[PDB]
Amino acid sequence: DPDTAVTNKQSFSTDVIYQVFTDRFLDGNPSNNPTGAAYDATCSNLKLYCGGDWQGLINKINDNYFSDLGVTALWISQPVENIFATINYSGVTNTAYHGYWARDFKKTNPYFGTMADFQNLITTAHAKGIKIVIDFAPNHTSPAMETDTSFAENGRLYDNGTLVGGYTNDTNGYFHHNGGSDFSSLENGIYKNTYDLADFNHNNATIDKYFKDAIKLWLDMGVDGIRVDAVKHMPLGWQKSWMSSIYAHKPVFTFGEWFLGSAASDADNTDFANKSGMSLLDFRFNSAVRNVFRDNTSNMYALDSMINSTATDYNQVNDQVTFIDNHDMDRFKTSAVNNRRLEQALAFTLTSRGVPAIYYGTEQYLTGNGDPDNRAKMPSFSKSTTAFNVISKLAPLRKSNPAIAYGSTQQRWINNDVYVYERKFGKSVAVVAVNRNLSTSASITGLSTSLPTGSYTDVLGGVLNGNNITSTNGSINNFTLAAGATAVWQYTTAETTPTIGHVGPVMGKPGNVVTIDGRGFGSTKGTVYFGTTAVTGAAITSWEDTQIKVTIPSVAAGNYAVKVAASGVNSNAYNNFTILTGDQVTVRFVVNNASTTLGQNLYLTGNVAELGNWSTGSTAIGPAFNQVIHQYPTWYYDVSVPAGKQLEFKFFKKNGSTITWESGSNHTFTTPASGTATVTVNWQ
Ligand SMILES: C[C@H]1O[C@H](O[C@H]2[C@H](O)[C@@H](O)[C@@H](O)O[C@@H]2CO)[C@H](O)[C@@H](O)[C@@H]1N[C@@H]1[C@H](O)[C@@H](O)[C@H](O[C@H]2O[C@H](CO)[C@@H](O[C@H]3O[C@H](C)[C@@H](N[C@@H]4[C@H](O)[C@@H](O)[C@H](O)[C@]5(CO)O[C@H]45)[C@H](O)[C@H]3O)[C@H](O)[C@H]2O)[C@]2(CO)O[C@H]12
Ligand SMILES: [Ca+2]
Ligand SMILES: [Ca+2]
């Protein structure tokens, strides 16, 4: 199967996501709508249910709405059964229409459909060539008041019906009872509740087990991806472990939400994208795009910085999910914001690097500021807007031109209002030109590109005042970029020499299968290389010009580059491939009376790659935590370690450039065969 087929659940660079709020989209079956109290046919009051079910989506896939639009994967609301309670916050009734108030992750939401309607969604969606990504929020259940079982459902969790436990009288400790998080530090936010939400304690083997089993269920149904909610509030140590159990079963493209406010680099968010085993939702990109196009609080140089910076901070910038707006922010379209600016932010987004995502109704210039006005009902299904055109003309390019899916980025011309970037992959090229100034045109002169000699037509057909150009060895003739224009020029040619574009997942135990998508491979099963180690024959399950499928060799856990050899020809390397020692389990390391000075931080390292291999660098584990679960001088950290394995390790303080190890002999610990465990030691 081609890299671009609908069966490629490990890569989305060729796709375009359509994030839909199931409820707010289309009531396709009124028999499932709730009774009275928490239902609104007029869908006037936005906090209550409105209808929108899975059938409506099926109705819309079938009647070709998404096909003429060009989106190739829909990202729906958390499918699990939510709480039926009606919560009343300061006078106003609130319901679980958003899907985030999980109750029992093992069943379907009756208001959205049944297991059978759910299969239908898959089968139908896959038939029309559309992947299904689903939201999943394992950080919590639902709102709950510790001292009041009457308040909502008291975060009660069920296992396919059987009541596991509530928030009050939570003896087994399936949740944290450390009060409300005030978001002052990263750890304050992982171990304390987020809003009034019952926070799960993933160090409880029962919970750890529950979730690994729950997600299995949804994967076995055929979902093509997962959008993990609030990844910023769960331990990376546990999520990594969770993530490897997923990649060991049925690997799908997983990306999580690490909510950021600005476009600036962020240490933690970057360690997460690189070390977790998943990619994030690109909030830095969203700020840039919004500042330049919507808000007008920055210029084009801010875009170029964000492009250059994010490529440097993320091991795979291509796995980040971009978007101009979403359900947790003001809708891009507003009274001041001109229709053309939205159309440009859309063009820019669709042609930029990473997996693009489009919040529903953007193609209809839908507005609404704040939650819940941003989550209004789909006002119409007209396939007539200009925005609809832009999406339907550019979106297919991800599937046709590899420079748009896999390509690198590079500025070719710029000033405060105009940006001209090139996207290239091997011989395939894509130039994009944008003039956000809506009143003054621009005289672009002296512009190089990698478009071979020829005459180029604006792929957009000029819907956005774009023009056609002429190359003479990349040298582009002088031309006037129209006011508010944006044009796209391209060139594409069947690649002959091998070249990798994307690998996924990019983590896993030897024995798993990873997908090496690319071009110019060949029809004859050649040789995959994890660094210096060769792979051939049976180990390679599939081999085509566009996509190889290989079995991770059984070699020393660690970072590795990935090369492919097409008949004596070595390709470019895909760096940062993490190979795990094998099945993972989360483990909480605790250390007593580890006094430290001002600015001095604790870290952890051991005798396996998962711990860094006696490293004190970035492969090390830390800094540790010393506030919520355990208090300073006692530190602690949740880490993903190999299962059933004798381990050695020491802690060390790293204030400035200097290191100081705990003395004596290494601490030892043999990990469980599955689950989680807490290990405590004293600072030697
Ligand atoms: C929403 C977002 O918040 C955090 O993001 C912040 C960044 O961390 C921080 O650096 C800075 O930039 O601010 C950011 C934005 O606030 C988290 O980091 C994100 O993970 C989180 N987003 C996730 C999902 O995208 C989000 O859709 C989802 O939200 C669902 O649940 C919430 C909570 O129930 C719903 O919120 C609305 O309704 C609730 C009931 C309202 N809260 C009540 C009250 O108004 C509030 O002020 C109080 O704190 C109380 C107790 O008195 O909780 C009440 C809230 O004001 C409404 O917005 C939301 O509609 C629903 O979709 C999740 C969980 O699924 O949060 C993630
Ligand atoms: Ca309905
Ligand atoms: Ca948490």
Side-chain angles (χ1 to χ4, degrees), residues 656-679:
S657 324
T658 136
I659 290 295
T660 142
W661 298 79
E662 51 178 331
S663 57
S665 308
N666 296 354
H667 299 288
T668 7
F669 189 53
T670 304
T671 39
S674 55
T676 70
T678 303
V679 72

Side-chain angles (χ1 to χ4, degrees), residues 27 29-30 32-33 51-53 111:
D27 189 350
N29 169 339
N32 60 63
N33 315 15
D53 45 62
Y111 298 119

Side-chain angles (χ1 to χ4, degrees), residues 421-651:
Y421 54 94
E422 187 170 294
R423 279 302 299 292
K424 78 172 307 196
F425 181 74
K427 297 172 180 100
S428 294
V429 174
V431 166
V432 177
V434 192
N435 168 41
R436 70 168 186 162
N437 199 308
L438 300 130
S439 59
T440 318
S441 52
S443 269
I444 311 314
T445 57
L447 161 94
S448 295
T449 73
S450 302
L451 293 168
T453 304
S455 77
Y456 300 99
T457 300
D458 165 7
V459 177
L460 287 159
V463 287
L464 307 179
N465 307 310
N467 55 270
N468 314 257
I469 68 166
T470 319
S471 173
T472 33
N473 287 88
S475 206
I476 309 296
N477 298 143
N478 290 330
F479 74 101
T480 284
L481 189 46
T486 153
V488 177
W489 304 297
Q490 58 153 359
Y491 179 72
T492 200
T493 176
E495 200 74 30
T496 159
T497 117
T499 169
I500 299 153
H502 177 267
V503 174
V506 289
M507 177 179 87
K509 75 173 179 191
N512 286 357
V513 181
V514 302
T515 298
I516 316 190
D517 280 325
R519 284 278 182 294
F521 290 159
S523 305
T524 316
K525 191 173 291 188
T527 155
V528 174
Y529 287 69
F530 283 77
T532 66
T533 319
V535 175
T536 56
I540 305 179
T541 69
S542 322
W543 187 298
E544 303 191 338
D545 184 58
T546 51
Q547 167 188 125
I548 311 176
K549 280 203 165 172
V550 57
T551 307
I552 299 174
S554 297
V555 333
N559 189 95
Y560 289 88
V562 181
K563 256 192 192 290
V564 147
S567 30
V569 189
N570 291 355
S571 71
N572 65 300
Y574 210 80
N575 316 262
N576 302 112
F577 191 89
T578 299
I579 282 179
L580 298 151
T581 309
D583 285 345
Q584 305 277 274
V585 284
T586 301
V587 171
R588 175 165 306 185
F589 292 84
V590 190
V591 57
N592 296 310
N593 23 263
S595 305
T596 66
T597 190
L598 170 58
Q600 181 165 71
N601 246 133
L602 231 62
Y603 285 90
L604 170 66
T605 184
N607 70 326
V608 307
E610 281 81 357
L611 295 173
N613 266 326
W614 298 112
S615 180
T616 70
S618 315
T619 37
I621 293 298
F625 287 146
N626 58 22
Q627 296 175 80
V628 185
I629 298 176
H630 289 287
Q631 303 65 217
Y632 162 95
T634 294
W635 302 63
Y636 69 106
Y637 211 71
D638 295 343
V639 186
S640 172
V641 153
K645 194 79 153 46
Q646 162 82 95
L647 303 179
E648 283 186 65
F649 59 92
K650 272 206 180 72
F651 279 95

Side-chain angles (χ1 to χ4, degrees), residues 72-88:
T72 61
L74 322 165
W75 150 24
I76 65 181
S77 310
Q78 168 132 264
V80 309
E81 165 181 285
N82 279 226
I83 65 171
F84 305 125
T86 232
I87 312 185
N88 187 58

Side-chain angles (χ1 to χ4, degrees), residues 139-147 155 167 170 174-201 230 233-234 628:
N139 173 56
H140 59 274
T141 27
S142 61
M145 209 136 257
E146 174 112 40
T147 49
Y167 196 76
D170 172 26
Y174 297 120
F175 304 95
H176 297 140
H177 309 272
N178 297 116
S181 148
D182 62 32
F183 307 145
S184 46
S185 60
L186 175 70
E187 86 161 276
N188 172 90
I190 299 161
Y191 300 103
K192 290 181 144 192
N193 309 307
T194 262
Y195 294 126
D196 66 334
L197 298 160
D199 205 12
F200 278 113
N201 166 28
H233 316 278
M234 287 164 279
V628 185

Side-chain angles (χ1 to χ4, degrees), residues 21 47 89 94 97-98 100-101 137 140 143 183 194-197 227 229-233 257-261 326-328 371 375:
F21 240 76
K47 299 288 220 194
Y89 294 103
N94 262 264
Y97 76 88
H98 44 246
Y100 298 112
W101 296 343
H140 59 274
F183 307 145
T194 262
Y195 294 126
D196 66 334
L197 298 160
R227 202 288 307 211
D229 179 59
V231 306
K232 183 177 179 184
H233 316 278
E257 175 230 24
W258 188 296
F259 199 109
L260 276 171
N326 68 1
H327 59 295
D328 289 346
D371 164 15
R375 295 119 124 137

Side-chain angles (χ1 to χ4, degrees), residues 117-135:
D117 293 325
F118 189 75
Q119 251 96 130
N120 254 103
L121 219 210
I122 302 314
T123 54
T124 297
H126 281 192
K128 239 84 196 296
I130 301 173
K131 292 166 184 180
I132 296 291
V133 162
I134 57 161
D135 218 317

